Structure 1
Amino acid sequence: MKYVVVSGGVISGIGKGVLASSTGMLMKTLGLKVTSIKIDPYMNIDAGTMSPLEHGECFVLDDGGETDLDLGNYERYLGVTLTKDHNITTGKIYSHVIAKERKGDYLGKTVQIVPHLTNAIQDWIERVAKIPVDDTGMEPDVCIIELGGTVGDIESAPFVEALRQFQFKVGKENFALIHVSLVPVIHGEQKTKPTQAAIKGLRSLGLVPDMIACRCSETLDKPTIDKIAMFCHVGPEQVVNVHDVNSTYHVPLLLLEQKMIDYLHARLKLDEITEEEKQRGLELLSKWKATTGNFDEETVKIALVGKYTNLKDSYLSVIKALEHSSMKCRRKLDIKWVEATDLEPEAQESNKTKFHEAWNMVSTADGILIPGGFGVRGTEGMVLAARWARENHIPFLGVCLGLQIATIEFTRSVLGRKDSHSAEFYPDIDEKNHVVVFMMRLGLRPTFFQNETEWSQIKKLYGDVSEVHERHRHRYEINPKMVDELENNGLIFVGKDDTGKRCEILELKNHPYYIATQYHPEYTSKVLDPSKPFLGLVAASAGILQDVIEGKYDLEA
């Protein structure tokens, strides 16, 4: 096997993940089977305790674990299904060694941070790097290991020990390291010294960088590359630079044009790794040239309406799912961020100025999106945003709480029933629009189209396939008692579960595009294969939905 560490810097937030999965996207250009592990220095075992206000969205796996949010950036860049084990954390590995301590697997020795815990970390990395995350069941050929925090943190010290020892447990010419570092510009001059002091830190703990990659406000000057390479064990051609680019999807072409892989090919001796891989490599490059061409080659404006949209990382997957689809439509994406509570009739006396800004965004947008918010607060405004797109023929997608609110609105305006509300307003009883279903429903579950719905815009985007598979995170579903009334009035539930009891998709009959999903489709959007409910929202906002379904926008003929 081969391995690539990505680590480093004098600051957290320097750029690692885009240098990580982006390096891993280019390993796939070579045809390689590829995987990724994110080592987190924080002490949470999983994101299941972490509220979406800090550390952001609880990204959800095929295996239904609530992981680190960043893992998602690797399931888009590489096109892989990761597992709950691919997110190593400081709380996860202290728990695993402490479990073995009380089980007595150390044969009554004292157990130490070195060597026992640093062995555990190496034994975890080489365990997880066997798992076949890729489009065929063979073990990966390269693993990208991203070390979070900064080298020289008292929180990241166990992992730089474990990785140093791993440079020997794995050989040189099988392991390599990319160190990501800061070139601050002040008084209009690129200063090298934070890279010198952080490389001094790196060699102290015993890792040696095979590349340096700079966060800089500028293109690195020719002398800045020379004054970094005069102070580190790299040639001047391995001081990589992730400068400003037209969009984040260009970074793997930037790295490849900086000859980043033409070194890793030699430095990891990758001639030592079938025709299927060689072909899938060339196809991945062709599909990259296609999505890149679709950026160079008109705007679509979408209002995303939810709770606390100020906290923009809390909707990260939704943004990326709109970006992947917008490159298929060749159209520039312009998300308007609306706080749902600023739409409310009460906000007009409380905070009038922001209420007009919110309503201008809703009124301007070519599509509306209710994104599957957290908790009840935004609901009253999200109803009025769903009403705005039901009545006037604006394209719409509701995700999770958005299907809940598409159904509350269609109840509250088409059936009358003005008292109806989410099951969250428990003591109203008779007018609850939803029912509890704890089984929380999580992870990849199927959904089956209702066999008559040949008219459907959404089941056309899915290619007329009989079923779909999707991620879930819900404790409530629409009350089955009401669903005949909604189906008879035209809010047709075009997809349901295995039992047929659960409301998984709706489409409003005879509207240009009004969909909702109980699942979160943004947790399976990929850059070459955009998630179909979001592709339909962009394509109908562009007024091109028919031609996307007919195939005028696939990447290769």
Structure 2
Amino acid sequence: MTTNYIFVTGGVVSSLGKGIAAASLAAILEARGLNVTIMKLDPYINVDPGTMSPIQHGEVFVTEDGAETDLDLGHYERFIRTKMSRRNNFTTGRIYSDVLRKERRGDYLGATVQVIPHITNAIKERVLEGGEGHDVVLVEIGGTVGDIESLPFLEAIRQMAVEIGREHTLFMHLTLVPYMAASGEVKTKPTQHSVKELLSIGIQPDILICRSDRAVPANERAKIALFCNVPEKAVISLKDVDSIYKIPGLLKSQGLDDYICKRFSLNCPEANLSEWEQVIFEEANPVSEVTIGMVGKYIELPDAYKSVIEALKHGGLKNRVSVNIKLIDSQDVETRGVEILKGLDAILVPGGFGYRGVEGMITTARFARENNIPYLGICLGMQVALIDYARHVANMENANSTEFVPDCKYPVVALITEWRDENGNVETMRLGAQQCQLVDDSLVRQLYNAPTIVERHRHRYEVNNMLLKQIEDAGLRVAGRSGDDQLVEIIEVPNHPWFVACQFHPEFTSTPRDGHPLFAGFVKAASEFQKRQA
């Protein structure tokens, strides 16, 4: 068994959906019974994505092993079952850190460390590492062709391709075929040049992807084929669609996978894409609709809550109900007030960092709680709900977190070391998939249908056990506790129709085909509430 590789690049303009295209392909390859995986190389100096804000790049994906990575790794999780790890994604900065460290400790024995060959060695070794044991490995190269930001990666690839032979490698290149309404037609010139640019750095494309807002005519595809040294059948058209889940169908329709196995001499079984066909059918034919309001901070760029949005969508798919998300700034609830929260069937509060208008988030939690409006809280949203309940029901005046107000007096959230009571008596970050002991009598235990569950984490401060007993005894159900320290993983409100909040990140496990119990429950409850109010 020898591993085959396909490289993905893109030119002309960014934001064409390279990760989307790659994931869609991989889904098909899995559907054909092939051991396919995927990695992404990122043109950034940032070593870890954790050093950047949510508004800067959107949500930072949490892998099973706790690694912080590019959002697209979560996208990969939503198309293939191969699990991603720290080996599936790294940056330019990461490379330099490693190489410079090797220099420092004498690993290059007095030699000059150069881009060629030393930086490219770091790269190609990481690629081979991640591709170990797989039939097909997709490698997405971030950045845009022709820009200096990723030329080292492109060079490493060229070298690799030569080393492994053309029989184990294909070049897939995304382009843009823009529509010019003034002329009444699309243009191909930009594409022709994009290809020329790859050629100038030693790369000859095998497969072309023509992104556009409409199907590209065969004639135009032929013209491209001519100028790019590519067979007509290898020029694929890819018009804009209203759902990513429909892309596998399109790629399959144009015979992409057949071509690929032919190129790799693989006797590949016919792709079973019916799993997504089902999803598509259900997606396009919901029986109902429901309005979900979301209160947060990074709503100025939906990418920040992308994983959440997708998870909500998945709940909707399972309940055949359209999910309408209202973006609400916590600072407006703080300013304008709860009037914002009117007209909602259910309310959701996401995680994240920053004090900002969190008091408005608390106000919102209070609102949904007291008005029996289905509620779902995640990470920070749980912290918020905790404060709400504690301060207004358990009478914990100024219930708060030490991360914002160390001298709280009622630090309902604090570092385990920082746990303390209102009298000053006392007694890093949790990451990745961790086992949570669910309370057998809780709803969540029954929603998952299991004694324990395993879910992803990312947070530093915990529920302060010193005061927990006040909150819990006041009438709040701890629906589940972690493990060794029995940390409050998840809570439920005794008499609320559906009020659930947790420490873990269910949004990194939900898929369009499998769904997820908490979103199924939340969204269903949302619909139920809507009907109860009508």
Question: What's the TM-score, normalizing by structure 2?
Answer: 0.91
- 1:82-127 Cα deviation digits (max 9, x unpaired): 1222113111222223233333333433232223322332221111
Do 1:34 and 1:143's aligned partners in 2 also have CA atoms closer than 8 Å?
yes
Q: Secondary structure at the match of 2:62?
A: coil
Tell me how far apart the structure 1 counterparts of residues 207 and 191 of structure 2 sit (CA, whole Å): 12
Match of residue 141 from structure 1 = 135
Which residue identity is paired with 1:316? K
Q: Secondary structure at the match of 1:54?
A: helix
Q: Secondary structure at the match of 1:120?
A: helix
Match of residue 266 from structure 1 = 262
Match of residue 422 from structure 1 = 401
Which residue identity is paired with 1:536? G
Q: 1:198: how far off?
A: 0.6
Do 2:39 and 2:140's aligned partners in 1 also have CA atoms closer than 8 Å?
yes
Do 2:402 and 2:414's aligned partners in 1 also have CA atoms closer than 8 Å?
yes
1:320 aligns with 2:310: yes
Tell me how far apart the structure 1 counterparts of residues 207 and 467 of structure 2 sit (CA, whole Å): 61
Tell me how far apart the structure 2 counterparts of residues 469 and 410 of structure 1 sit (CA, whole Å): 27
Tell me how far apart the structure 2 counterparts of residues 95 and 515 of structure 1 sit (CA, whole Å): 42
Q: Secondary structure at the match of 1:231?
A: helix
Which residue identity is paired with 1:522? E
Matching of residues 139-538 of structure 1 within 5 Å: 139-186=133-180, 187=182, 188-271=184-267, 282=272, 285-297=273-285, 298-344=288-334, 347-348=335-336, 359-360=339-340, 362-437=341-416, 439-451=428-440, 453=441, 456-463=442-449, 465-538=450-523
Which residue identity is paired with 1:12? S
Tell me how far apart the structure 1 counterparts of residues 468 and 138 of structure 2 sit (CA, whole Å): 47
Identity score, percent: 44
Do 2:443 and 2:479's aligned partners in 1 also have CA atoms closer than 8 Å?
no
Matching of residues 36-47 of structure 1 within 5 Å: 36-47=38-49
Q: 1:269: how far off?
A: 2.0
Gaps of 5+ in 2: 418-427
Tell me how far apart the structure 2 counterparts of residues 390 and 240 of structure 1 sit (CA, whole Å): 51
Q: 1:294: how far off?
A: 0.9
- 1:124-159 Cα deviation digits (max 9, x unpaired): 1111111xxxxxxxx221111000011221111111
Tell me how far apart the structure 2 counterparts of residues 7 and 202 of structure 1 sit (CA, whole Å): 9
Change (3 A) 1:205 1:485: same
Do 1:457 and 1:513's aligned partners in 2 also have CA atoms closer than 8 Å?
no
- 1:52-78 Cα deviation digits (max 9, x unpaired): 221222211111122122221111111
Tell me how far apart the structure 1 counterparts of residues 386 and 121 of structure 2 sit (CA, whole Å): 53
Match of residue 550 from structure 1 = none
Q: Secondary structure at the match of 2:90?
A: strand
Which residue identity is paired with 1:9? G
Change (3 A) 1:340 1:38: same
Which residue identity is paired with 2:259? Y
Matching of residues 87-98 of structure 1 within 5 Å: 87-98=89-100
Kindly report structure 1 stretches of 4+ aligned residues shifted beyond 6 Å.
Answer: none
Tell me how far apart the structure 2 counterparts of residues 246 and 154 of structure 1 sit (CA, whole Å): 33
Which residue identity is paired with 1:110? T
Do 1:493 and 1:503's aligned partners in 2 also have CA atoms closer than 8 Å?
yes
Which residue identity is paired with 1:382? M
Do 1:176 and 1:268's aligned partners in 2 also have CA atoms closer than 8 Å?
no
Tell me how far apart the structure 2 counterparts of residues 523 and 168 of structure 1 sit (CA, whole Å): 37
Gaps of 5+ in 1: 131-138, 349-354, 546-557
* Number of corresponding residues: 514
Which residue identity is paired with 1:483? L
Do 1:60 and 1:443's aligned partners in 2 also have CA atoms closer than 8 Å?
yes
Q: 1:422: how far off?
A: 2.5
Q: Secondary structure at the match of 1:542?
A: helix
Tell me how far apart the structure 2 counterparts of residues 243 and 429 of structure 1 sit (CA, whole Å): 55
Do 1:181 and 1:215's aligned partners in 2 also have CA atoms closer than 8 Å?
yes
- 1:407-445 Cα deviation digits (max 9, x unpaired): 111122222334322323435442222221374222222
Do 1:303 and 1:369's aligned partners in 2 also have CA atoms closer than 8 Å?
yes
CA RMSD of superposed structures (Å):
2.1
Which residue identity is paired with 2:101? A
Tell me how far apart the structure 2 counterparts of residues 444 and 164 of structure 1 sit (CA, whole Å): 36
Do 2:355 and 2:404's aligned partners in 1 also have CA atoms closer than 8 Å?
no
Which residue identity is paired with 1:359? E
Farther off after superposition, 479-488 or 320-329: 479-488
Match of residue 102 from structure 2 = 100
Tell me how far apart the structure 2 counterparts of residues 204 and 168 of structure 1 sit (CA, whole Å): 16
Q: 1:476: how far off?
A: 1.6
Question: What's the TM-score, normalizing by structure 1?
Answer: 0.88
Q: 1:500: how far off?
A: 4.5
Q: Secondary structure at the match of 1:472?
A: strand
Tell me how far apart the structure 1 counterparts of residues 229 and 29 of structure 2 sit (CA, whole Å): 23
Farther off after superposition, 507-516 or 92-101: 92-101
